[PDB]
Each structure stands twice: as C-alpha cells, then as structure tokens.
Amino acid sequence: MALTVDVAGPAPWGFRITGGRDFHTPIMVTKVAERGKAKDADLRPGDIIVAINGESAEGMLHAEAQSKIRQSPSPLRLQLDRSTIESEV
Ligand code: NA
C-alpha cells in the first residue's frame, strides 16, 4: 500500500530508520515512539520510505536520509510503502 504521511514537528520526530544505499537496502521505519510526533502522524514500523519531502529516498545513504529527516521543516512529508495483512476468519 502506497501512502503519504505528513508528520507534525519540529524534530525530534520520534521514530527510527534502518537501511540506505550504503547497505544496499531501502530506508525503512523500524520503531515509532509511543509518546512522540510520529505516533500521532499515523506512521507504522515496517513502512518503507520511498521519498522524503518529495525527494526520492532510493539512492540516499543511511546518514543522508537521517540528516534530511532531522533537518526537515514541519511538517515532515513522507511517501511510504506499507505492508498490509489479511486474516482468515
Ligand atoms: Na526537523
């Protein structure tokens, strides 16, 4: 599922990221702090960050994506890919 999340600021945003071009992996949210701005914003552990403030995250180094997020104006605009689930009942 593709989605666009706007996170109210300013930093600290209250989430964690993994990955980047130097690890040859995508930028992914791994944790959202229970008391924090990302919790309000509808951001979920496991969301892949496709774009940061309209700029593609594809070729960003870990530290590069980290820095762009921390330096970001409010709101932080993330383009996301989210893994949906289906349960049998
Ligand atoms: Na910021």
Numbering used by the authors: 1 to 89
Sentences copied from the publication:
PDZ-peptide complex either by soaking or co-crystallization. Ribbon diagram of two adjacent PDlim2 PDZ-hexapeptide fusion proteins. hexapeptide, and the comparison with similar structures. good model to investigate the binding mechanism between PDZ domains and the NS1 PBM. HN12-NS1 are crucial for their binding interaction. of the two basic residues (Arg16 and Lys31) in the PDlim2 PDZ domain. compromising the binding between the RSEV PBM and the PDlim2 PDZ domain. residue is a critical site for the binding selectivity of PDlim2. PDlim2, the Ser residues may allow the special selectivity to the NS1 (ESEV). residue to Arg16 of PDlim2 is strictly conserved in all of these proteins.
a type I PDZ binding motif (PBM). proteins are widely considered to act as scaffold proteins. activation through intranuclear sequestration and subsequent degradation. assay confirms that HN12-NS1 and PDlim2 interact in vitro.
